[PDB]
Design an enzyme around this catalytic site. Sequence first.
Site, PDB file in Angstrom:
ATOM      1  N   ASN A  13     -29.057  24.253 -22.713  1.00  0.00           N
ATOM      2  CA  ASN A  13     -30.192  23.353 -22.977  1.00  0.00           C
ATOM      3  C   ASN A  13     -31.555  24.076 -23.071  1.00  0.00           C
ATOM      4  O   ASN A  13     -32.579  23.409 -23.211  1.00  0.00           O
ATOM      5  CB  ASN A  13     -30.243  22.216 -21.944  1.00  0.00           C
ATOM      6  CG  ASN A  13     -28.906  21.551 -21.696  1.00  0.00           C
ATOM      7  OD1 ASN A  13     -28.468  21.390 -20.549  1.00  0.00           O
ATOM      8  ND2 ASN A  13     -28.215  21.177 -22.763  1.00  0.00           N
ATOM      9  N   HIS A  50     -33.045  25.915 -20.692  1.00  0.00           N
ATOM     10  CA  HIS A  50     -33.742  26.049 -19.419  1.00  0.00           C
ATOM     11  C   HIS A  50     -33.211  27.300 -18.716  1.00  0.00           C
ATOM     12  O   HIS A  50     -32.071  27.699 -18.946  1.00  0.00           O
ATOM     13  CB  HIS A  50     -33.543  24.807 -18.539  1.00  0.00           C
ATOM     14  CG  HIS A  50     -33.910  23.529 -19.222  1.00  0.00           C
ATOM     15  ND1 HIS A  50     -35.226  23.154 -19.388  1.00  0.00           N
ATOM     16  CD2 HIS A  50     -33.114  22.582 -19.765  1.00  0.00           C
ATOM     17  CE1 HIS A  50     -35.194  22.003 -20.040  1.00  0.00           C
ATOM     18  NE2 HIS A  50     -33.944  21.616 -20.283  1.00  0.00           N
ATOM     19  N   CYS A  88     -39.097  27.312 -14.286  1.00  0.00           N
ATOM     20  CA  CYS A  88     -39.692  28.448 -14.975  1.00  0.00           C
ATOM     21  C   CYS A  88     -39.370  28.303 -16.461  1.00  0.00           C
ATOM     22  O   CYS A  88     -38.201  28.153 -16.822  1.00  0.00           O
ATOM     23  CB  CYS A  88     -39.172  29.767 -14.407  1.00  0.00           C
ATOM     24  SG  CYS A  88     -39.751  31.246 -15.281  1.00  0.00           S
TER      25      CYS A  88
END
Lengths: 265, 264
Positions: A186, A188, A223
Amino acid sequence: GSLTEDGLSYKEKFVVRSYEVGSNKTATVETIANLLQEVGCNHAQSVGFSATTTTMRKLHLIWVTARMHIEIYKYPAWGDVVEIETWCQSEGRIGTRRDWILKDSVTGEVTGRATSKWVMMNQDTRRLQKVSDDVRDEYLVFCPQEPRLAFPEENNRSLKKIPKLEDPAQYSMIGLKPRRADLDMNQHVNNVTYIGWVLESIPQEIVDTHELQVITLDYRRECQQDDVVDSLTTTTSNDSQFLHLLRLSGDGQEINRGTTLWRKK
Amino acid sequence: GSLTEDGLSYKEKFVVRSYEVGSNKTATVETIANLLQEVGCNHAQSVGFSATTTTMRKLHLIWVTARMHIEIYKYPAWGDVVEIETWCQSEGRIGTRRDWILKDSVTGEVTGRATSKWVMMNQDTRRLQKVSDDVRDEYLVFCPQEPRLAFPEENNRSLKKIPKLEDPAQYSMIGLKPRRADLDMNQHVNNVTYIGWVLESIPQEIVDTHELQVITLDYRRECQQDDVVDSLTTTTSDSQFLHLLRLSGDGQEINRGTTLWRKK
Ligand SMILES: COC(=O)c1cccc(NS(C)(=O)=O)c1
Ligand SMILES: COC(=O)c1cccc(NS(C)(=O)=O)c1
């Protein structure tokens, strides 16, 4: 990989790979944390998930890791078979918990154990929320009804408060950025990369003379791929303990905080 | 994992993992390059290696990767089983070669193929040797005698000369450092990390619209744990790129290569 007889837990066997081991010819804590994530994905897949439920997909809600606690007794050597057993449990309206037991396939001896707390978050607004009753019924049929804890003890080190590292830090690793290998499907940043970033601040001498026994991590922020991170470490202590802190390079926005316990090899 | 009937090649099956796939739900080229390294280690282990021979241990001699060439037709999806077959071959006193064939387990269709050239080096110093006759006899009993090529075609992509990228580069990724996960059991940077570093300079738009079909890499120097790297890229064209990895400070060349990308 397959669900147990009762269908309330999942077991999988992994053969340790050449690129998965460190300088001691034994698996790294990141390899273990990757293997725990894999058996958790396969457990969710085996019970009809893609671990978003029907109501969670309908409301744009996802499960994010709030805390991760890992304790290793023996790291599996290159070529060894490690059996990992995982299961989920509801923690009321606070969220969910996923536990793991790591065993040697040959001896059947427990070589490690892990526990993790997950919070409900809106995928778009990033706003954490309590668990609704419609979502709790959708996963209660795949969870043991009686409490099954990997860390049962009345004073276990998995539910301990973590303080914030004061400046100046004893040790630091500045300018850490994720690459495309550090991202999930995804886009991330994988939760395992934060663990590897926490351990970057630890000096090479401690790694060459000690073995990581316990690692507790509290996740506070996400992050981004274009973000830059700073790993900070201070010894708080036969056994050596550390206080860790991950923060963005610029503003110093806290992304992670944790503690590690190391024993003399 | 097991050696074939003749004992001159090795086959292994891998089930693709959740953390091994990219944004397209298919394996990444680094996952494939990691899997190729794993089946090579297991092939060396199955024939009595610790691919260092007995006379190589006494002489303090190791095999280092000089070149890596990978061509993918289909990237295995998350949960798929990928069968990889590997084998070694001598290339006279120049060095050794290791080839791979990647297939889908269900269909048995070739989904990829790879080839790599390895040079003999003194572990203590960095002097490349020309392979002695005592070493050739030790591994010729585990190699097919007749030539078995993954890329047989006369004058193909795997044996092409690579030019040096001129400055200014079109794209760049500066300040890349290895972490402890990027190191092998001997503390040297894993050869898969250079591939991941080469692709960091490629813009996200190219990655989101194209798929990496071919990747050729020439290794010139080793990157230490405390070294800082710069990935540089220029389009030479399907889209083609010219790549260059160099140290941040002096600009000492560590790697050079080319990539070919097809529209998704
Ligand atoms: C309680 O959890 C949070 O506050 C929070 C907020 C944002 C992110 C996360 N987790 S992670 C794995 O995405 O880094 C936790
Ligand atoms: C021909 O190869 C070399 O000159 C050489 C020198 C040093 C290193 C390498 N490869 S690697 C994978 O160890 O980084 C090749």
